[PDB]
Amino acid sequence: ANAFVRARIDEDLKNQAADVLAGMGLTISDLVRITLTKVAREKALPFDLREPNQLTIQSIKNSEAGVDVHKAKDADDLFDKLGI
């Protein structure tokens, strides 16, 4: 009932993460077990693992500039305009 996680990784990334973790009394295998335990318990990912991708960033840049933004009066009008 004891399996192994085996993951290919960049060696420099591995060493750096290992340093960061060692600072807090953890090993990489500790973080792996802790993380997978959370995933299995919650059936979901930990928060904020990745930054928004290029498409999301571009949408945000556009909206912040006022480009391709659309108004709605309330929930009904919004859903109507979205076609949902």
């Binding site: 928060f47 960033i57 919004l78």
Partner: protein, 90 residues
């Protein structure tokens, strides 16, 4: 009451969700909660600030792999994108 906006990308994202036969009732109910200032959201939505240098942006989960990204300020609610982790973060 906050002004209501949505981005063009959000329109596209919502069409894609429809096409994929997602449960739009879940998304619509979350959106209504947002519009009605029913804040903080119920815990099930796992609502939290977007990891980004862009201020006011938040991230709520319709499902574990169905995300809504929106901006929320005192005067503004904007629906920005929605989709899977791969679509938004991948």
């Amino acid at each position: 009451q906050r002004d209501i906006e949505y981005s063009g990308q959000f329109s596209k994202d919502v069409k894609l969700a429809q096409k994929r036969h997602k449960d739009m009732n879940k998304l619509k109910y979350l959106m209504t909660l947002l519009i009605n200032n029913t804040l903080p959201l119920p815990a099930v939505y796992k609502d939290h600030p977007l990891q980004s240098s862009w201020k006011g942006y938040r991230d709520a989960h319709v499902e574990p792999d169905w995300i809504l990204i929106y901006k929320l300020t005192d005067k503004l609610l904007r629906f920005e994108r929605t989709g899977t982790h791969a679509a938004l973060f991948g």
